[PDB]
Design a binder for this molecule. Structure first.
Ligand SMILES: O=c1[nH]c(-c2ccc(-c3nnn[nH]3)cc2)ncc1O
Ligand SMILES: [Mn+2]
Ligand SMILES: [Mn+2]
Length: 200
């Protein structure tokens, strides 16, 4: 079929909030979304997975973890996750320092993606177009800090997580995998996938 533009794919297939946050992130690092387009799409995808990982997960009045998918969570519930990704560098470290001084949890050396108030740990989310194990190993080597939990998704449904602890229920992680499958399939119909995959 005809080759589409990755720009078009991104703007048509990700929520505008995600696209804007990705643009802001690339600007901050001196990267042009209109030239590093596979990167733009990868940044959107990862950001979306971070949001999806956190979506609908609360902690109840009794202090326990619950899932609320209706868009009307009662006011006494607290979000289970803090989202660190998507924030500019100053605000991200501000949020991390806050958590670390509050919870007593040690300070990471690089910004992680989420903080889990149930499991009391930072999470690094990975999304890879390669084998999850190789990618798990790469993230781990950069982290070097036994505290941060790593959770890797691929575009083909494989996951790998620290100590085989997957944090979330199967249905939550299936939502993420279904979304990644949808992204891959749509890129493929626009003849964007092979390149996108190979560029990692
Ligand atoms: O885990 C994170 N990953 C990424 C990410 C950034 C760029 C790319 C990329 N660049 N060129 N192609 N892809 C892929 C992932 N950003 C933040 C993360 O926490
Ligand atoms: Mn990150
Ligand atoms: Mn990440």
């Amino acid at each position: 079929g005809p080759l589409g533009s990755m720009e078009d794919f991104v703007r048509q297939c990700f929520n505008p909030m995600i696209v804007e946050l990705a643009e802001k992130a690339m600007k901050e690092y001196g990267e042009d979304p209109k030239i590093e387009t596979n990167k733009f799409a990868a940044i959107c995808t990862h950001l979306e997975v971070c949001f999806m990982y956190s979506d609908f997960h609360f902690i109840d009045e009794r202090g326990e973890s619950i899932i609320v998918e209706s868009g009307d969570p009662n006011a006494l519930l607290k979000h289970r996750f803090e989202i660190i990704e998507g924030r500019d560098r100053i605000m991200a470290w501000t949020v991390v320092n806050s958590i670390c001084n509050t919870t007593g949890v040690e300070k990471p050396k690089f910004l992680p993606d989420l903080y889990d108030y149930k499991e009391n740990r930072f999470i690094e989310i990975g999304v890879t177009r390669r084998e999850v194990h190789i990618y798990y190993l790469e993230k781990a080597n950069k982290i070097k800090s036994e505290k941060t939990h790593i959770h890797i998704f691929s575009f083909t449904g494989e996951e790998m997580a620290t100590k085989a602890d997957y944090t979330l229920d199967e249905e939550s992680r299936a939502r993420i995998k279904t979304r990644l499958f949808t992204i891959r399939q749509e890129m493929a119909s626009r003849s964007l996938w092979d390149s996108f995959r190979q560029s990692e």
